[PDB]
């Protein structure tokens, strides 16, 4: 039944969870990102970005180059399975993706592409 | 069900693969580690160490303190699911573990604890 997870990125560059498990029952999966901090998007913006483990470094690197006004994401980046907006304190964004995009046998990571954030704001997504 | 994997750690501190999928059909799984490089253990020693993604930091940190002569691993580290010994150029070691030690929705990482290597020699393992 459970095909969504609520995730928080705070003023300390921490996710409240570093592991998400997608039930193979789920045709679609929803990530509800919120920012419970006080700092604005230009200081402590967070996004939720999902890719293969192998692709994460390249997504982080090319996102950095794209800058704040592009949510630190390379536009139309085919390595990105799912992304939210970059959000600041008190904001929220959701993303729904087809679980068909998660291939059995792949390793997945989620991360924030705000420059410097992905060192601490990284987690692993798996299927149960 | 292939219930083993051949893994190489080389002189450029690369795994030949950064992703292992263990077939849920496997009661046991075997890692065959080789060092195809020419650098000896004291400069380019590799081990294969498997833990949860959560435990990897602690295992790597506690491993430093043990030094070369204890394979840069905390003795009897309950967080280590599987380990090989530390090997140098043209050496081999194998480890067999029970797949019951893995859980279907949990994230596992394999890494080398030779200080500095785990930045470049970190891979992801999941139960498929
Ligand atoms: Cu962030
Ligand atoms: Cu090594």
Swiss-Prot record, chains A, B:
CDD domains membership: Azurin
UniProtKB keywords: Copper, Disulfide bond, Electron transport, Metal-binding, Periplasm, Signal, Transport
Cited SUPFAM superfamilies: Cupredoxins
Residue ranges constituting the Plastocyanin-like domain according to the UniProt record: 2-128
Keyword Magnesium: no
Disulfide bonds: 3-26
GO MF term list: copper ion binding; electron transfer activity; identical protein binding; transition metal ion binding; zinc ion binding
GO cellular component, one term: periplasmic space
Cell location: Periplasm
Record: residues binding Cu cation: 46, 112, 117, 121
Keyword Transmembrane among record annotations: no
Listed PANTHER family: AURACYANIN-B, OUTER MEMBRANE PROTEIN H.8
Known function: Transfers electrons from cytochrome c551 to cytochrome oxidase.
Name listed for the protein in its UniProt record: Azurin
Native species: Pseudomonas aeruginosa (strain ATCC 15692 / DSM 22644 / CIP 104116 / JCM 14847 / LMG 12228 / 1C / PRS 101 / PAO1)
């Amino acid at each position: 039944a459970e095909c969504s997870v609520d995730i928080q990125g705070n003023d300390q560059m921490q996710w409240n969870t570093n592991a998400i498990t997608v039930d193979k029952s789920c045709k679609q999966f929803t990530v509800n990102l919120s920012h419970p901090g006080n700092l604005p998007k230009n200081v402590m913006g967070h996004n939720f970005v999902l890719s293969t483990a192998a692709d994460m470094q390249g997504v982080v690197t090319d996102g950095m180059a794209s800058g704040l006004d592009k949510d630190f994401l390379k536009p139309d980046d085919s390595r990105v399975i799912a992304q939210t907006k970059l959000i600041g304190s008190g904001e929220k964004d959701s993303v729904t993706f087809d679980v068909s995009k998660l291939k059995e046998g792949e390793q997945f990571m989620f991360f924030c592409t705000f420059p410097g954030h992905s060192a601490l704001m990284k987690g692993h997504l798996t299927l149960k």
